[PDB]
Amino acid sequence: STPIQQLLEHFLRQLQRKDPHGFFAFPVTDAIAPGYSMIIKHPMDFGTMKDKIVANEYKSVTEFKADFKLMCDNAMTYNRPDTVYYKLAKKILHAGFKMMSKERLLALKRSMS
Ligand SMILES: Cc1cc(=O)n(C)c2cc(N3C(=O)CC[C@H](NC(=O)OC(C)(C)C)[C@H]3c3ccccc3)ccc12
């Protein structure tokens, strides 16, 4: 509904397309993941990121990237390396940081001249 909201909704869509199972769609709770609220002090997921975009809570692309990387880092902390959760998190962390790279953002900035 503002330019930044629209750009971030775009990025979120593209990241969520890489999670066909919806592993990261909603907050992980203790009711599904024993010890999660002890092990993971700052949970994050795509649903919560969608809400923050909607609420225009991200001042910048940096802040949005921070939330994305927190989500992936938590998945890689709580879950063992042979799991679907860990693997996908590692994968989509690198895919998303390529998508939203400093170089790609600079080009986007020149185009907004
Ligand atoms: C144990 C566990 C750890 C973890 O890091 N993640 C991301 C999980 C995700 C889980 N989920 C799935 O395995 C299948 C999808 C499910 N998401 C989901 O159902 O989303 C909709 C409703 C959109 C289909 C996801 C999950 C995430 C959060 C709470 C419960 C299940 C279940 C357990 C964990």
Side-chain angles (χ1 to χ4, degrees):
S1 181
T2 66
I4 192 57
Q5 287 174 298
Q6 294 296 123
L7 174 53
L8 298 184
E9 295 213 337
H10 165 74
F11 286 146
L12 185 51
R13 278 188 304 270
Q14 301 321 142
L15 298 177
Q16 291 210 261
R17 285 157 70 267
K18 306 163 181 304
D19 178 29
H21 296 278
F23 298 154
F24 305 123
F26 288 103
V28 180
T29 66
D30 289 350
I32 205 66
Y36 194 88
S37 70
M38 293 201 203
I39 291 162
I40 304 296
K41 299 290 199 270
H42 295 108
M44 187 48 61
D45 65 281
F46 286 140
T48 305
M49 291 171 65
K50 177 62 185 281
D51 293 351
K52 291 171 73 168
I53 301 175
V54 162
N56 207 13
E57 296 181 41
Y58 287 114
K59 281 72 178 295
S60 73
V61 181
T62 302
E63 295 191 335
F64 171 91
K65 285 164 71 185
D67 276 351
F68 180 62
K69 175 170 185 309
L70 179 58
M71 187 183 94
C72 300
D73 286 343
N74 291 340
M76 284 184 287
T77 302
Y78 173 86
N79 301 282
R80 304 315 189 75
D82 64 318
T83 65
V84 298
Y85 305 125
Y86 178 105
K87 298 174 170 169
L88 189 61
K90 186 179 217 279
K91 182 183 212 177
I92 69 166
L93 175 63
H94 294 138
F97 274 63
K98 188 170 192 88
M99 182 172 80
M100 303 184 279
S101 61
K102 290 287 156 75
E103 54 199 329
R104 282 210 147 87
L105 296 160
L106 195 60
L108 177 48
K109 294 188 342 199
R110 296 195 300 272
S111 89
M112 284 306 108
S113 333

